[PDB]
Design an enzyme around this catalytic site. Sequence first.
Site, PDB file in Angstrom:
ATOM      1  CG  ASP A  30      32.917  -1.002  30.779  1.00  0.00           C
ATOM      2  OD1 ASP A  30      31.834  -1.455  30.353  1.00  0.00           O
ATOM      3  OD2 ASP A  30      33.870  -1.734  31.122  1.00  0.00           O
ATOM      4  CB  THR A  32      27.389  -4.961  30.964  1.00  0.00           C
ATOM      5  OG1 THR A  32      28.303  -6.043  31.188  1.00  0.00           O
ATOM      6  CG2 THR A  32      26.750  -4.556  32.283  1.00  0.00           C
ATOM      7  CB  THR A  33      25.481  -0.892  28.292  1.00  0.00           C
ATOM      8  OG1 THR A  33      26.569  -0.487  29.130  1.00  0.00           O
ATOM      9  CG2 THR A  33      24.532   0.281  28.094  1.00  0.00           C
ATOM     10  CG  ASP A  63      36.690  -4.423  26.344  1.00  0.00           C
ATOM     11  OD1 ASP A  63      36.714  -5.087  27.402  1.00  0.00           O
ATOM     12  OD2 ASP A  63      36.295  -3.240  26.291  1.00  0.00           O
TER      13      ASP A  63
END
Lengths: 528, 48, 519
Positions: free
Chosen positions: A54, A87-88, A393
Amino acid sequence: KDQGNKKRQHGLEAKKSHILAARSVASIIKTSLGPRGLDKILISPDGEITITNDGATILSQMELDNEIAKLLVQLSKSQDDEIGDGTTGVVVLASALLDQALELIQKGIHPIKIANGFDEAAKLAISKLEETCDDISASNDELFRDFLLRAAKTSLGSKIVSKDHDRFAEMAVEAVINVMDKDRKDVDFDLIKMQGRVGGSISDSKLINGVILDKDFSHPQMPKCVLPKEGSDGVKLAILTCPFEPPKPKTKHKLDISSVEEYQKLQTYEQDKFKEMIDDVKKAGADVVICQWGFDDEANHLLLQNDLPAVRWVGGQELEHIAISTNGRIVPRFQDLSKDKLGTCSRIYEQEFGTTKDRMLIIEQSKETKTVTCFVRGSNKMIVDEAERALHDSLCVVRNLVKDSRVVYGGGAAEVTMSLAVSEEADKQRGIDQYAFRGFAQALDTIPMTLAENSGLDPIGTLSTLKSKQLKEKISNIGVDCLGYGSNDMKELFVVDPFIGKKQQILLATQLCRMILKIDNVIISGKD
Amino acid sequence: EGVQAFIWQEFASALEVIPTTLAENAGLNSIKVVTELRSKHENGELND
Amino acid sequence: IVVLKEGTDASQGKGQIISNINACVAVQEALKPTLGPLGSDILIVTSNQKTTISNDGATILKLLDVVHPAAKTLVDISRAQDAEVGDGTTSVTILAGELMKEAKPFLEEGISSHLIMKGYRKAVSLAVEKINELAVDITSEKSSGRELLERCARTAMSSKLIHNNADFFVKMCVDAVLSLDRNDLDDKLIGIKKIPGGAMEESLFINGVAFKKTFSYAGFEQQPKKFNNPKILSLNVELELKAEKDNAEVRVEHVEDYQAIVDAEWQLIFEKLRQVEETGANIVLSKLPIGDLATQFFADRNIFCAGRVSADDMNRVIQAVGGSIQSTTSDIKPEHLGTCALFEEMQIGSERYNLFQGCPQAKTCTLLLRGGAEQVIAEVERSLHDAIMIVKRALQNKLIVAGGGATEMEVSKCLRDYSKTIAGKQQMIINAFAKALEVIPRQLCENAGFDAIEILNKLRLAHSKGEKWYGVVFETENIGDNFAKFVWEPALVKINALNSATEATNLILSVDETITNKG
């Protein structure tokens, strides 16, 4: 002050150092993009060791002394409190935009012009994406539920939760629906709490529309379940904030025992007082007694004789949660109990999980409540944490889907379409802004390329094939087949992500790129 | 499609070196001259 | 044992002043990115690992904590300018740094600091004279007390629903702040309310307060609706027979007790209303609805009343009437009564509205907008708010000069013209000061991404002929008349910034040889 060892940079040096730091940060989470991301072994500076793919956790646990990188880390942390799933992708897109800005600067374009061009390109890309959105709710409610469950299962399948992903997705959907207004479509994560215990497996996870309190009903022989009495006025719960002890004189607040005779007489009087208190409780119609403090042995014995379960050592916030769930009121003392203040719940019972000694209880409600708890079981703390993250999530995905019925398809297809539109606009656009638009399109192209690289496919061939298919043949949703699929064209694979989530990711990436680009000097004070 | 598209795009981008060098050596704004030429070529052909 | 200089020695001669110039130039370069609204931010980290990003000059100066003894003088001067003025903090530092840069060649050529200081003082005096000449303050010269602000207001209304009718709304925008105390202006005194129906040009401007009619009980069409010099009484609660707020539960088991309670309540309300008659109030306003009995009593005494007044409406009433609001009717006294020059009920849109007009003590203004739809009224309100803010900022300081570097260009041109007729080193010093004055527009253009060389050349060409209001346009990269575009900055701010920069430059350059201890 602290001039010694004070860091400083020049314009031509800072404009490159910032981009180098951005690339270094992007390399942290480049491999974590997409379902096929790589697991990284991190040890936090506080000694927390864990394995995860994550990006949010990777950036949170991974600290650094580079101020430019700290901007990306803080942006990722702030996003983690909103959706957290992009985020990534947001970091990768910001890094690509920063690289494009560096290239533009090397060509002689001022940073402010680059920022304005990137903002305009982001606006155009968002507009095109919105125009290409598909409305699921307006087409079929059954298909809407099917897509919600499908996206939840797709998100769950990448973690340990794969064992009970179906129940996890059902719990997430129900929790989101219960704590939201259908018309308003606003969901607060604070209304859904996460709880769990070590031991067992995730198959024992349950959704509770109230509070658990982790109590064993005091004496082990008390009833473990109170029924609504065949459709009566629910189950009455007494909310108290004082211990169940006999009244004592205010002069000393203590009872003195001299010998056996006095011991027995005082015990008899205390039993009479407890009987009076229990009669007062019963007259109010309460079935289960909840107190902020503990209960005496005589109180427990007499309540067992009257089949009145007793809940002990409940915190003030826990009592407030009980009142909110049961729409009740907090009664200071036993003598103040009344039918107008007792909470009304569907039922209260003890739920046992394996051999855990907690012997927690569950309070259920039929009407909408502002307190929902997602109980998770697992053989290890890491398993429970991963399951809770998967639940978070799924809740975020369902919240985004209900917030806006318009959805977009994953696998980079939306990114490819936006890049094509931005490139067409740049070709149409005149002036220096054309270079900025083209750079923004190239930065958008990074996401599908990174996904192809992480999936084991040739990124150069994959990106070109996707662009050609979406440009010459027809406009569709063709992305990177990160997971095992028989063909491309995710539209048939039903790989769907919220539209507003992608819009927020693009906006955050653009804002972060502008923030890093609009900082020209960095000053770091020395250390004593 | 494939690597050919990327290489052709890179070749097209590199082709603009000559006008960029001419603009730089002439004391003109390097980036502005290329944009002006590209905009003018949308109407003319091998004229500006 | 104890060494004041900590064993550190210092050289003497032009080297010390050159090092001071270098330090000041370093500070100027550090603060350069923050100049202007588009200035870049600077990331500063304190010793406690606290990171702050901002382009505010004061914050940058506070977090920098310059250790050089000389540059610290400029830092302190900038901090004092920010504390006392609050505008131009970065401009003073930039001007000081530019002057220090210009002084370097003069020192290298052997010119003493006294000559440079005297020349800078003369140039600054000339600049102050030119600023005073350029300063704009119009009362009735080709304008009026409101037109000067209506012209600025009309700009904010461009491409709006009231653009064609801006001539009417600009007057209301100007009056929203001109008719009130100019010593303290705020957005809470420019409340705007909407009334559906009617034309936009028919909007009514109220110097006091206005509110909707909320009475629908017995006694209607009996109390007076108009007064010449009414006295206004403001109340919170405890006016009607059956209190809606701060009431209590009453239980009665016997008919006699019920009758006694009813009679007691009637007597209490009768006394509380007789208090209103005794104090002499004409208009009674309360946050709670008024029952049949109270309104009938007021009508019988020729007293107007209206309940259900919101807290914001009560605050507006307090500000307009200049009085005070009483918690309950039991403490009504004439000391809390206000006075207004006119009270009348409006029939706008076939709906009744109560307002106070012409009150000399009014401290707030209320606007009642009209229109065919609520969305149009909302757009009108937004445009009015923008124009009101613009005119408020203009009125806070009516002594203004052309912005966008036009003032600096005019001062530089005048200084060069004077130097052309001045002999000696004074000419060189004045020329250097005039050239340094152009740093502000140069840095503003650079931070804005414009081509500094071309924009500066165009500004020089345009400003050297015709009007002196030509300046840099930031909306589009070109040169235009800032005065016509209503782009300006206070003259006093410019004068204070120039004085502070000159003082800092002289203080740092006042010493050519110095022996400074380390610490």
